[model samples]
Target: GPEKMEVKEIGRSSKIILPACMHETCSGGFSLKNDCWCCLRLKTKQARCWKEKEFPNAKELCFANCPPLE
Candidate 1:
């Protein structure tokens, strides 16, 4: 079976770090400068903020929608 895929954009105003696996899976890069958090997934062309779990923080997480490569 093939997996579905999609793209989502998220925004954040806090400083946080993302795991290495996330970067690999999403093909995304993250950067933190002051109170700004940014992440971009080259493979999905999606962006989001890197932050820990918190109220309303979940909304800042982005997901990419994509069809199976095969």
Candidate 2:
């Protein structure tokens, strides 16, 4: 007989971010700034990764509340 274990990936190699107030900061948002790599790459298509101004504020919009790397 044998046993198996399931696994899932969460975030950075060794980083973790706790939720902010019932995850309202994430689950209830529609902005690309909410810890979504799937969307972050879109900026790269425009010769930009993140930031609208030279020394930005738009870049400050973030909500990377990801669990530890699992």
- C-alpha RMSD by candidate, in order: 16.2, 11.3
- By summed lDDT, which 10 consecutive residues of candidate 1 come out lowest? 28-37
Give all TM-scores, in the order shown.
Answer: 0.15, 0.24
Candidate 1: regions farther than 4 A off = 1-13, 24-70
lDDT of 2 by residue, 1-70 (tens): 4564665755333433345332322333333334423223444344435544554443454454444445
Lowest lDDT block of 10, candidate 2? 21-30
How do the residues 1-70 of candidate 1 rate in per-residue lDDT, one tens digit apiece? 4565665557443334444434312322443332222443345645554444553453344433111244
Residue 58 miss distance in model 1 (angstroms): 13
How much is 28 displaced in model 1, in angstroms? 19
Which pairs clash in the backbone of model 2?
A: none
Residue pairs with colliding backbones in model 1 are 5-65, 5-66, 6-64, 6-65, 6-66, 7-65
Q: What's the residue-level lDDT of 31 in candidate 1? A: 32
